[model samples]
Target: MSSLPVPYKLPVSLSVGSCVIIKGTPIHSFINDPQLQVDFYTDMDEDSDIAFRFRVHFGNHVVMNRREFGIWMLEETTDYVPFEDGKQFELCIYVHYNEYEIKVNGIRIYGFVHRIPPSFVKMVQVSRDISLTSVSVSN
Candidate 1:
């Protein structure tokens, strides 16, 4: 991928049409509510085709997919593959790319849909779960 000046952490609130990547250590203590949700926008006529990847430390590993067409639509959740929480994990997100590739401590875990286009994305909110330490992004 194209490299840019990486940041130490992501902003609490990010605007639309922007891409983000969160890299940090996974939370392994709790089992529930360890899901990190990112909120973004999509055009009314555009299709969801973004890509995301991440690694977690414990069993409470899951990714929830939601869509908001003026309103929020909750999609299915992806199960956690396997990872070590105390160790560092890398979350790479590709907006409008239609596929997500996740690597845990360097190993590829999964690749999923980009439910929306980057151009359509208006906002992105990284929600609860995990101890996020760093992040980066590109257009």
Candidate 2:
């Protein structure tokens, strides 16, 4: 199982056409709307920059944001969140040419545009609120 709160780095380089898959559940004590954050970073360096911050909040709310050079962009909201508190679930981020297609429990729910060159994203970090059963990256 992947550790919680601490960042978990991807095992392979992430690209524009890749998919980030996360399988996990919110612990029983999940409070304050436990969240699952999927972040894309430039590298594994001390000061890696974030390209995207895709987050799921509460039991069913989603938000997407971008950070470049340490400046965060406007936060955008989506209505496709499909998670249930304390339940096992699947979340997938599919990188596409112009935007990311987000899937929740195998259903395509939302999309967020690329704020920076997708190729700049070399690492991924998943953290907070939930216990991860598995995490994988693939094309």
Candidate 3:
């Protein structure tokens, strides 16, 4: 297990097979960060088999999951719901026994994968408009 310094801006990177958690307050007023992006390359492909969950806080919380690959490759604003701005929240990601689970402030949000296997994921990046106090990654 390890941790990294928190950044004032957006667009951070994460490691594969590793779980990252974002903990902090909202930088902007009225609206939380606009875009939080996570990118990774998996060997599974576009149509693999996996499951994961994502969750968010502020105003209303939401959670969703994906069963097979190609169903949901990545989590974007279009696919995953957005959280309110100016609200304090925590983003937690974990993968155990091939199951991926994302928790926001203790809430589960999304679970799914693409054709490629999670091992294929090389790097994970987070970007958009947000105010973060700290970020931690562990396996």
Candidate 4:
């Protein structure tokens, strides 16, 4: 991202039928106490404008959620943690016309509703307890 007041701008528009792919590992590539978060936002730091929040919590569950208009809505949770201790994993978020299909380890886990249009998103941020080898968005 060039490190500034501005965020990393995506190279292409993420519309229906596009997919964002992530390949990475958790903290220390093993221990399950850390949490990694991937957020799709409209601005740089507006918490309520998060269109999609995909979090892999090492506490035995992963969750997908959204915060809109200053309110956190219902979240979809699953018990599968697709990350390996010392191994790499593949995570993909496929944008559908009305929802997102999230997959880890090449298996679909949960879906996040289209609270906001995918094309409206502008920033992609990844944070906490992990390292990313690559991040790619494609149609």
Cα lDDT of model 2 by residue, 5-107, tens digit: 4456674565778888888886644465677788888887536778888887756678888877777889999866777777888888898999888888999
The local distance difference test score of model 2 is 0.78
Pitting candidate 1 against candidate 4, the one with the higher lDDT is: 4
Q: Rank by TM-score, descending? A: 2, 4, 1, 3
Total backbone clashes of model 1? 16
Give all candidate RMSDs, comma-separated: 7.9, 2.3, 7.5, 3.8
lDDT of each residue in 55-92, candidate 4, tens digit only: 87775788788888888788888887766765677889
Candidate 3 lDDT (Cα, 0 to 1): 0.47
Residue runs of model 1 more than 4 Å from their true location after superposition: 1-19, 28-33, 41-58, 70-74
Across 46-79, the per-residue lDDT of candidate 3 in tens digits comes to: 2433233233333444433343445654543223
Q: What ranges in model 4 sit over 4 Å off?
A: 1-12, 29-32, 46-48
How many angstroms is residue 101 displaced in model 4 relative to the true structure, after the best TM-score fit? 0.5
- The best-first sequence of candidates by lDDT reads 2, 4, 3, 1
Whole-model lDDT, model 4: 0.76
Give the total clashing residue pairs for model 2.
0
**Candidate 3 Cα errors over 4 Å, as ranges:** 1-18, 29-33, 41-84
Per-model TM-score, in order, reads 0.55, 0.86, 0.52, 0.83
lDDT of 1 by residue, 53-73 (tens): 132324655554544434434
> How well does candidate 4 score on lDDT at residue 37?
82
Top lDDT hit = 2
